[PDB]
Amino acid sequence: QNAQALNTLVKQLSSNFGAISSVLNDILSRLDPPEAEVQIDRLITGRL
Amino acid sequence: VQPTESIVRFPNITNLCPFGEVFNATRFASVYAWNRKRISNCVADYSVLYNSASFSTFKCYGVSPTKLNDLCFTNVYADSFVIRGDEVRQIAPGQTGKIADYNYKLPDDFTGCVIAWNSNNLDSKGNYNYLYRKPFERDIYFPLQSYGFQPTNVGYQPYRVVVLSFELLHAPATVCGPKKSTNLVKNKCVNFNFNGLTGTGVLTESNKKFLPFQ
Amino acid sequence: YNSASFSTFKCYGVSPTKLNDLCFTNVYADSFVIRGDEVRQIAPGQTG
Amino acid sequence: AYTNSFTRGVYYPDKVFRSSVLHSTQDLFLPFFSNVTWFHAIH
Amino acid sequence: QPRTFLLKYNENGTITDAVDCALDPLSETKCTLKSFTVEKGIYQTSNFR
Numbered sequence A: 001q002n003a004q005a006l007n008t009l010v011k012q013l014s015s016n017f018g019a020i021s022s023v024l025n026d027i028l029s030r031l032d033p034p035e036a037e038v039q040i041d042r043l044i045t046g047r048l
Numbered sequence B: 001v002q003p004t005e006s007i008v009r010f011p012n013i014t015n016l017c018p019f020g021e022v023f024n025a026t027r028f029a030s031v032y033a034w035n036r037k038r039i040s041n042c043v044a045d046y047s048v049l050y051n052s053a054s055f056s057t058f059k060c061y062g063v064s065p066t067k068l069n070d071l072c073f074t075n076v077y078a079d080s081f082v083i084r085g086d087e088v089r090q091i092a093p094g095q096t097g098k099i100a101d102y103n104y105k106l107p108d109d110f111t112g113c114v115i116a117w118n119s120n121n122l123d124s125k126g127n128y129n130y131l132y133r134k135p136f137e138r139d140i141y142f143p144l145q146s147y148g149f150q151p152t153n154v155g156y157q158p159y160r161v162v163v164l165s166f167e168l169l170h171a172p173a174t175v176c177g178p179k180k181s182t183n184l185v186k187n188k189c190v191n192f193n194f195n196g197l198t199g200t201g202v203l204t205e206s207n208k209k210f211l212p213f214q
Numbered sequence C: 001y002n003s004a005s006f007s008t009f010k011c012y013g014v015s016p017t018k019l020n021d022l023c024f025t026n027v028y029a030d031s032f033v034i035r036g037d038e039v040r041q042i043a044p045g046q047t048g
Numbered sequence D: 001a002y003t004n005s006f007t008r009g010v011y012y013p014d015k016v017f018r019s020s021v022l023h024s025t026q027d028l029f030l031p032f033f034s035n036v037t038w039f040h041a042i043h
Numbered sequence E: 001q002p003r004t005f006l007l008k009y010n011e012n013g014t015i016t017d018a019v020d021c022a023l024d025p026l027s028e029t030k031c032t033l034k035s036f037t038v039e040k041g042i043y044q045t046s047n048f049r
Ligand SMILES: *[C@@H]1O[C@H](CO)[C@@H](O)[C@H](O)[C@H]1NC(C)=O
Pocket: B019, B020, B023, B024
């Protein structure tokens, strides 16, 4: 049960939550801040 | 542990990309049946395009034009065609109207740039050649029409457009920015960048048996 | 806001109707000429 | 003419190494135990 | 056809086996558990409609 809950928490980093990519470093390489923040707010909301 | 230095690892290729052969073509295609060059195995300066006074717009989606020189793509697809100056509004993802459906439907999730400019100097004469009417479909009784361009035409003037669509796949990259490679560093915490895949970590050489395509 | 002369009156973070309700520590007024095409660029997060 | 696919015709779905792991992909695959049409070069 | 497959990558990172998750109910069970071995039990693999 502990291992399943950790594996589930780690695996949830791969999810988009509606961002254009689930990788934070993609958004920061691709997008300038005024448009990047809209994508990162979706990732923060899902990861939180 | 904060990273000690940055490491940049782009492919060992230096030939400049053929954008000039798109942007200065003798004729841009009739929009009902647009044309599409593929760029691959070259170095892509985007600042030479974005800095140019020649462009009435340079609008990008899924990427910011300021960032394009950091990216490293597997292919780049450049569409080329002519439209009236009002219709540049319809060349964007999620639009509605005659250009947005009947000849050049963009994907709803497009990552790319639309680069458009007035060409009333060179496409007007009138000239009646440029013929008009799913995502990246060519829409070859049936509807056929063509634009009437005279230099006296602003919304009815000819605009030339290039649309760059970017391939962010995980394959070996081939269309990469001017950002020059560093040496590799091992057993040290570094701000690494392989083909635009940025991260931070201790790089160390591995015993893992990657198959030749991986 | 009531003048016919202003071709645009675009406000951010406040509505032009509401401004008579407010007090500010300061107003700065930044004054310049541009070509009409670049009036788009005079906004938070715009580019060019 | 027909024969069975059995479990033939799986392929590496992406350009990625993975090891000692089970990965559930969804992609265009040949379905297991489906029929495959069978033809000849000659005779 | 568009299908979910569960792929067994071995120690050397070659795919050595797979489960077609839409073939039969045992294959849905293997894919529900992300596992090629299934222990004795009752497994809620799907919802039908
Ligand atoms: C188009 O032609 C001009 C003049 O020959 C040249 O300076 C320019 O570099 C060409 N365009 C591009 C995008 O290279």
